[PDB]
Amino acid sequence: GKGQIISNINACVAVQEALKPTLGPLGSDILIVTSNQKTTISNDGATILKLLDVVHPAAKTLVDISRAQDAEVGDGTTSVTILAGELMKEAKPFLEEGISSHLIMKGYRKAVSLAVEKINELAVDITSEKSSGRELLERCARTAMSSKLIHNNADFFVKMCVDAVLSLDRNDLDDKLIGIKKIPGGAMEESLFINGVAFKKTFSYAGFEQQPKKFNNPKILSLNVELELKAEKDNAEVRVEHVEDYQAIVDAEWQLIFEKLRQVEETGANIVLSKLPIGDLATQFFADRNIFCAGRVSADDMNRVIQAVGGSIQSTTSDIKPEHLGTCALFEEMQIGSERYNLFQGCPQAKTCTLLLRGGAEQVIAEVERSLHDAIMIVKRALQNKLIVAGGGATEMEVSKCLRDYSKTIAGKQQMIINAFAKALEVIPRQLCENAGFDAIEILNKLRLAHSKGEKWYGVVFETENIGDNFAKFVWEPALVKINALNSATEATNLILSVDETITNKG
Amino acid sequence: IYNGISTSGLDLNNGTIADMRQLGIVESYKLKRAVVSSASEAAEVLLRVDNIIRARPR
Amino acid sequence: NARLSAFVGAIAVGDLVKSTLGPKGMDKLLQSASSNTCMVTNDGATILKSIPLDNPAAKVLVNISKVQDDEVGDGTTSVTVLSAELLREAEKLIDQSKIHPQTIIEGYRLASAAAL
Amino acid sequence: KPQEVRKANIIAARSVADAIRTSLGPKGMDKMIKTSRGEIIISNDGHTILKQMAILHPVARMLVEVSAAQDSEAGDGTTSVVILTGALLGAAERLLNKGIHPTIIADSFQSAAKRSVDILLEMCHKVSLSDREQLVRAASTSLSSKIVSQYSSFLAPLAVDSVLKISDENSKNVDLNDIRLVKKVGGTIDDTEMIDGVVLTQTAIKSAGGPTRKEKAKKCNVLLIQNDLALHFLSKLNIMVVKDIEREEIEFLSKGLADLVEEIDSDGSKIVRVTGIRNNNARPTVSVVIRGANNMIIDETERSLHDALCVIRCLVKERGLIAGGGAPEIEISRRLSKEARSMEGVQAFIWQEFASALEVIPTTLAENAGLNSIKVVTELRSKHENGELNDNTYEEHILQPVLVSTSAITLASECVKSILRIDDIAFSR
Amino acid sequence: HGLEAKKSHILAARSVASIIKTSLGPRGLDKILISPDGEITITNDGATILSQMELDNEIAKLLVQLSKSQDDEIGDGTTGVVVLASALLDQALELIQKGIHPIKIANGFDEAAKLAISKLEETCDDISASNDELFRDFLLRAAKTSLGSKIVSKDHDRFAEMAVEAVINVMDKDRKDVDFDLIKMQGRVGGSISDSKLINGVILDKDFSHPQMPKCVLPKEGSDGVKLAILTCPFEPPKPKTKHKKFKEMIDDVKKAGADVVICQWGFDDEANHLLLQNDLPAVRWVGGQELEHIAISTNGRIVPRFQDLSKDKLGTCSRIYEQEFGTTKDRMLIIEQSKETKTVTCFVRGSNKMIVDEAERALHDSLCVVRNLVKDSRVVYGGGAAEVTMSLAVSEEADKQRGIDQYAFRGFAQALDTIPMTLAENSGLDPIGTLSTLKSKQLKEKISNIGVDCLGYGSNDMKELFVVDPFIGKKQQILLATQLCRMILKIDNVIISGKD
């Protein structure tokens, strides 16, 4: 019946209400408690919404469009869910007066055809004009770091952010290629950029391992299985018919491993890593040969080492071929972070890097880790996509303007629908002001003054509350966000409003 | 005041124990004997009554 | 309940004018059924006589306080406050003994002579 | 639980203050009250709300007695005194949780009220009654809250010239009950006669034989009565008779109370005037006569000119004037916050809470006017630091007499004191 | 929702915070706690009490997450941060009712926290820049305050020097890097605390197996250190991996090098230990995982994997190895010290009861964390409540000079700092309001100084004569975590609690 349509609209409001404070870098965060009891807190709407698992069928549409938003684009997963839900809230009083849903849903796609042609007119392609290679990455890095605790220390952080993307291919860039590990303790300005990978220092036990950490050209080799003798967990029982034979029972592993001890010496590999915990048998012979090794290496850490020197993993140490080996330029393990952490430097073939951060608490670094990801996604989409538009409410306020004038020239019921479509676009700049504390009543009223003077670049200043231009604030967003969001929000809005019945089978 | 040489008294202005002879705080002696003699006879009337029958409610 | 009405019942009535002792003492409102005839005052003898008391033990305290007003007329509230404190100490002596208070009364006469 | 019984009365008292808080100012929210008799009345005046509210709560009725004394003494601020009373009750809630006895709370209000008056008089500009230019513009601004505007220019010198004759010097309390507003049907606002001697409420004899006029009357020429043959008997003796004297005016005439006695009727009034009493004990009582056509004219005008006499009454008892709108309340909270370190003990913390309780009056004025609550209050502390009494209400002709702000704090100290001093209540009959 | 969760977050924090207010300070309560592993101890440390609290409220769970990270930095400021952060939430509730957004409260406390740091540094004093000879007495009396509530207070004179040398050995003068993994706490039942000695090395819990083996190791005619063998290959004939169903060659290679002790994880046999008895070569059975991976750096030796390359100078060298009998305990453990400075120091404490050992173990471990913060920053401040009063007067005075919306955010931060001295005043038997006004009057009209709440009974102010100091880096770390916690709570406007299956 008709009552199912209204019930489906209010069901999405409860999900949308939680995603409203998550819009913007300064907005509130959602605390989600998984059934596994692991607590995760982040401002990225993708991972957030994926943890809800709402039983309601129409709420699954928001999850489906969130995956395509994070895959094809990666930015704006929160805004695409709020914009798709806002159109359903404004259409609630229109359905109570007898207006069919088909006319309202059809009117939304009418403004989409005018929105696609509007984005192409607002897209300006500029690369080397009034800019350079270093000035492009430097000016855009301080924008995402503004209004944060790192703004005073951002001078040293921008220099490390520019060299991060230069170490990787400009045609193909991935934000996951730069790792960030939380290191408790130390100053936040003492962090450095490393091309290699670091470990967690999981060994708190003392009494061995003397060795200098300064190496010239170590050789890297991967080992798929654990080679060890001493084991802290399990144990071996020996019962036989002879008294003097109790010793030799546990020695069955000697000969074949005894030969493998000198195979590394003949090979010369100075780096040995494995995804399984390694005992003290491997660390024994490696001392004199100046061979470095680390046990209990994560699975994701070895995959980054394979792509570093171009080597490959092998099960045993016998049949390893010479092309599996690799060598870096320098290996230096310093005390940065008040603990010795191994790292690689000088790998020309390395397809990934790691950006280390320091701070007095792990929660402070977590706020910086999510803030650095926003600056990477801007550069990630500024390379492949040459169309750059003014974001932060600039383009959002421009789309609503022109659509109000196009409705006056369109006779019929589409006039109120397009006018309501442009009116619902005001939720994006509003919520951004409420999350930062600014008053959305006065700004949205005063912004419409200069907005009608013909200048389409007027944005919203995120630092000090006032009307201004995002061109001077260096707030940029790719044109792919505005194109993919309007197409996904319109399809998701027309899908839920057309539901006349909710069928759920139990058993 | 336990043993000897105590002129101290209760001073409500400063919230502490001060000498009342310097501030000039005195009370009538007739009021002292009247209250003690009345309170002593008042306590005897209630104690000398072992059982109290409920009065007729009006 | 005979001694309880003369102790707990008297202390509950005695604590009404107990906080009004002294110029810095507390105050109490006296409300009637219609509530529009009420008044506020610091007089201890007025509060006791105005409030209707169904306790037959509390009616005796009203007649005792009238002796101080006719003989002298000063410190009437202080008599009720001091008499209420004597019942607090006498209540602890009885329940821990359960002996006739007349023996305890004889102890008050010997102690009052040393106080004068 | 002796204190918990009092805390239940404090919460009930704060609910009454929050209801009146929305009615503060001309832009405040009105309150609809339906009487048990069926009469439906509504208005923003806090004195009329608490009068017909029929509060059955014993402690909450204290606000009615304070509001009655607020209009009888200062004449203005009956709504603001309720808000200031509830502010001290809300601040005292956290004081009881710290183990503070209300005696220290009540005793500290006496030192805080007397200190707030001395601080307010330092920033106040002392004025004298000898200047007639200030009293005209003072009473004219109070008439801007009523429908009458252009006709209020002639009403300003009417109230000023009446008080200056009876002001003299060092008069202290000046009773305005001796000044009666005469409401008669007919005439206009611009037509007014002072008649400084006295003005009655009644007409004269319309029968035959009545002289209706006498020269050198008190050998009784004129008499008052609280038969037709008695009028004819005294007509031969040339004795004027005025009957049907209202019982309410009996006590009035015994206070203020002839060279010439005549009856002058502008239109339809038929009123007798008396001039030149020249009594040594009795002063010069003046009764204001108000003329109007419709009933809504003389009514709204009566309440408008009555408030204008109260503002002038404040200047006679206490000289000086300050700018309204919560301007002085901001600087007082700033000075008492810094001077709180000069004290010691529990009383020192009370000065800090007393400064925050004075900021509710200017905050409510910003809330009821549609402006942002916290945003306007922050602008008050910012501008009042460099300038003194410059924020601009002087250009907007907003002048609040100093006695209203003084009596509002004085009556609030006694009202809150009478509350916390009640530790229990019982049935008494 | 907005009108619901925002009000409930304040009441949920006051319930948990009010529990530890009674245990704050040396006069607080010692709570009895039993770990699920079977360890029973009694201590007032808030990090252990808060970790044992299990509740379903998502707001109070943030305290355990913050105390877990703070335990590595300090660990003794658990009770200080929770009470201080809860005071910021009490002042934030009034700001919400005035129409101020909660995001402005988060940014308002950040500007007040950084401003109060520069004010405390101006009034701060330095140790090495004033008196060098008092640097020894500063570390001795710092642990006496925390140990005054325990039986340790009787022998505290000797135990005060044990915590000084343990922190210095694991750190560098310029670097000032201290790791809790380099300091271990162990203890056994029996004996008393007076027999506890500072050990420069590990425990190993070794009885030297058969008693005929020598309990002490000789220098062997002025050799270099004491030769020890760290090896993963024991002495026993091997086999292949295809079966599953030599004595004189291996043992003579070890004797040529001179290694006295051999380490092997698993156990040995009877006849297997008879060959090592004739050569005076003690054996090691049941090796725990704690005996390797660091300390050997201080040995300045080499590492030889196999018996073939063993020599005299390539073996690890230590000071000496001896077996000292402790009381009537049949364990008969060992003590290995070192002449040169090592990177690891393990404290050894004895007690007559199991509960007494664990009571003094965590009491001494807390003293190591206090000294850790004192050596990290040479400049120290006067504590005992004087830090919160001095920092509050600077913010309250500068709040009037700073205009705008943040003007009221600065006043709430100054009043929130007064919660700490008022809480300690109630635990000391003093008027919290009267003492707070007294401390402000003495620091204004008389002179600028630091006078806090009295921890021990006295008649007046000016605890500065007692030379009670607190580390500057320790107090600065507390106000940063308390401000970050108050901001983190405001960032969560909704409590999502999943069901059960």
PDB file of C-alpha atoms in Angstrom, chain C residues 16 19 23-33 35-36 38 40 50-52, chain D residues 6 56 58-59 61-62 101-103 107 420-429:
ATOM      1  CA  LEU C  16      10.370  22.090  64.462  1.00  0.00           C
ATOM      2  CA  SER C  19      16.276  25.273  64.159  1.00  0.00           C
ATOM      3  CA  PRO C  23      18.549  35.378  65.407  1.00  0.00           C
ATOM      4  CA  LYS C  24      20.500  33.430  62.762  1.00  0.00           C
ATOM      5  CA  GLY C  25      18.292  30.349  63.129  1.00  0.00           C
ATOM      6  CA  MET C  26      16.036  28.851  60.493  1.00  0.00           C
ATOM      7  CA  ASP C  27      12.421  29.749  59.686  1.00  0.00           C
ATOM      8  CA  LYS C  28       9.224  27.759  59.192  1.00  0.00           C
ATOM      9  CA  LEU C  29       5.986  28.321  57.288  1.00  0.00           C
ATOM     10  CA  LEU C  30       2.618  27.564  58.897  1.00  0.00           C
ATOM     11  CA  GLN C  31       0.074  26.521  56.261  1.00  0.00           C
ATOM     12  CA  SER C  32      -3.678  26.108  56.724  1.00  0.00           C
ATOM     13  CA  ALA C  33      -6.273  24.191  54.716  1.00  0.00           C
ATOM     14  CA  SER C  35      -3.481  28.137  52.419  1.00  0.00           C
ATOM     15  CA  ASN C  36      -4.385  31.813  51.918  1.00  0.00           C
ATOM     16  CA  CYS C  38      -0.922  31.434  56.295  1.00  0.00           C
ATOM     17  CA  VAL C  40       5.643  33.336  58.504  1.00  0.00           C
ATOM     18  CA  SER C  50      -0.908  26.895  66.026  1.00  0.00           C
ATOM     19  CA  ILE C  51      -0.098  23.432  64.627  1.00  0.00           C
ATOM     20  CA  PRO C  52      -2.797  20.930  65.682  1.00  0.00           C
TER      21      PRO C  52
ATOM     22  CA  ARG D   6      13.403  22.485  50.742  1.00  0.00           C
ATOM     23  CA  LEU D  56      -0.969  26.968  45.777  1.00  0.00           C
ATOM     24  CA  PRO D  58       3.690  28.146  49.767  1.00  0.00           C
ATOM     25  CA  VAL D  59       7.218  29.208  48.791  1.00  0.00           C
ATOM     26  CA  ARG D  61       3.850  32.766  46.523  1.00  0.00           C
ATOM     27  CA  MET D  62       6.787  34.880  47.740  1.00  0.00           C
ATOM     28  CA  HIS D 101      24.680  25.826  54.913  1.00  0.00           C
ATOM     29  CA  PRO D 102      22.126  28.322  53.528  1.00  0.00           C
ATOM     30  CA  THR D 103      22.915  30.825  56.306  1.00  0.00           C
ATOM     31  CA  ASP D 107      24.345  36.289  54.589  1.00  0.00           C
ATOM     32  CA  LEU D 420      16.291  28.935  51.898  1.00  0.00           C
ATOM     33  CA  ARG D 421      15.406  29.749  55.524  1.00  0.00           C
ATOM     34  CA  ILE D 422      12.372  27.418  55.346  1.00  0.00           C
ATOM     35  CA  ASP D 423      13.567  23.913  56.248  1.00  0.00           C
ATOM     36  CA  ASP D 424      10.104  22.291  56.515  1.00  0.00           C
ATOM     37  CA  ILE D 425       6.370  23.010  56.478  1.00  0.00           C
ATOM     38  CA  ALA D 426       3.442  21.358  58.255  1.00  0.00           C
ATOM     39  CA  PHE D 427      -0.321  21.721  58.523  1.00  0.00           C
ATOM     40  CA  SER D 428      -1.231  24.517  60.947  1.00  0.00           C
ATOM     41  CA  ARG D 429      -4.818  25.445  61.800  1.00  0.00           C
TER      42      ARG D 429
END
